[PDB]
């Protein structure tokens, strides 16, 4: 409940984490009673000996999807798209009779029917991408099962912006980042910010995300710990956004579209009821579970955002591990960015500890 007690909690938790996990650098933000608190440890660049700072850019990985979803939300609020619109209405070259009956909703929530996790790295232009989606054969009926995938929500992000007349990067920059004043959040890191761009570390070597089709939509975002705290404050309490389309899209990103056990699938965001049991999110965060194919029960109409929720997303790249969580009712939140990927269960357990102490 003080500036120093928060520090003590966060340190007691993070110091052993970095120690036993071999994390060169971490940056962590804690929103407590609406105010943000920031913490840094370690190096962003070992060779050049650069310390981690509140300006250091980390690769977010899958967390980028939360920016995808909200943008989609925004595009919904603008009247440009409806989640009930068929996928083929925005990419009419997808003529396969298996795509008949797949709507933007299903792409957004990984319920298309088993769309593959990753776009094959050999799919390097949008022609190969069209062929790839054309020859995909569904495992299930739309709406029957949830299979977490980059291809699905990536295509959702790519198609949601089509009516905008802008590219995904451009539309995001204009309709999300700039209105919310995230001047340290990038799909493409400009060369003059490259000293703040931490290096990820995979078995000792320094790495950055490799470009891929739809990388911006699924896993290509990089940001500082302050920009991420602002992102969490905006999604946690969006009443202070002047842009009503964005206000609304943020609300829709946390709408509850499907029920998977005790988890509710938003647009990118993933929600559980607060209070909750750690084991749920901890065990579920494991890549063996979070990537599984799980039966989904439709929620129609989608339940509006629930304030008594634990809203979160994990995301990792070759050399980075990142986790975001917040409880709107409690006005509480945590951002964790590390230039080294470590098991999502450990990440979530640490975040849970910290936030449980601070409630």
């Amino acid at each position, epitope marked *: 409940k003080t500036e120093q007690q928060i520090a003590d909690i966060v340190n007691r938790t993070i110091t052993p984490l970095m120690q036993e996990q071999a994390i060169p650098g971490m940056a962590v933000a804690v929103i407590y009673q609406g105010k943000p608190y920031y913490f840094t440890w370690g190096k962003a660049d070992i060779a050049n000996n650069h310390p981690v700072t509140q300006q250091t850019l980390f690769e977010l990985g899958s967390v980028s999807k939360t920016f995808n979803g909200v943008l989609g939300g925004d595009a919904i609020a603008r009247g440009e798209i409806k989640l009930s619109d068929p996928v083929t209405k925005y990419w009419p070259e997808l003529t396969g009779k298996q795509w008949q009956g797949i709507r933007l909703l299903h792409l957004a929530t990984y319920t298309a029917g088993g769309l*593959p996790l*990753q776009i*094959p790295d050999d799919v390097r232009d949008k022609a190969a991408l069209l062929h790839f989606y054309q020859n995909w054969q569904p495992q299930w009926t739309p709406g029957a099962k949830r299979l977490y995938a980059n291809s699905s929500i990536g295509l959702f992000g790519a198609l949601a912006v089509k009516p905008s007349g802008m590219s995904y990067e451009e539309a995001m920059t204009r309709r999300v980042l700039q209105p919310l004043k995230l001047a340290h959040t990038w799909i493409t890191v400009p060369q003059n910010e490259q000293k703040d761009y931490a290096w990820g570390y995979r078995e000792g070597k320094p790495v950055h995300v490799s470009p891929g089709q739809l990388d911006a939509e699924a896993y290509g975002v990089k940001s500082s710990v302050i920009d991420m705290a602002r992102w969490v404050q905006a999604n946690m309490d969006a009443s202070h956004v002047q842009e009503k389309t964005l206000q609304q899209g943020i609300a829709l990103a946390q709408s509850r579209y499907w029920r998977i056990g005790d988890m509710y699938q938003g647009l990118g965001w993933e929600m559980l009821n607060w209070p909750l049991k750690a084991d749920s999110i901890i065990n579920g965060s*494991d*890549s*063996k579970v979070a990537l*599984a194919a799980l039966p989904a029960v439709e929620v129609n109409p989608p339940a509006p955002a629930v304030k008594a929720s634990w809203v979160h997303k994990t995301g990792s790249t070759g050399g980075f591990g990142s986790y975001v969580a917040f409880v709107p009712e409690k006005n509480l939140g945590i951002v964790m960015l590390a230039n080294k990927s470590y*098991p999502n269960p450990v990440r979530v357990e640490a975040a849970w500890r910290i936030l449980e102490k601070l409630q």
Partner: nanobody
Amino acid sequence: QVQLVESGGGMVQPGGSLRLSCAASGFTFSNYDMSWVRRAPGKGPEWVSTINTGGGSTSYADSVKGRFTISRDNAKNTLYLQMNSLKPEDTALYYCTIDRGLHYSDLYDYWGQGTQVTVSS
């Protein structure tokens, strides 16, 4: 933490038998459908079999239908795969995992260490 620990692999002559075990820990094993997947030398992954939560549903790939029998013991949190009338075509590394369906390409920190099965003269 969610660990799956394969075992039962070994070297055998064609026609023999071999029971693979997969001991799970760190999660509610009885809540999830479990799959056996295999990876051949040089070749990519390949789905072998799947078994639903209650164990009343089983599903096999054409290559092994009729010869294998997947099962589970949710009391002792253990998946099993009985393999009968093996062929040199079944020589590969075997993993258990939570069911994703059929496709298992482009996989991250994920696979356990599996256990190898080898069938030849």
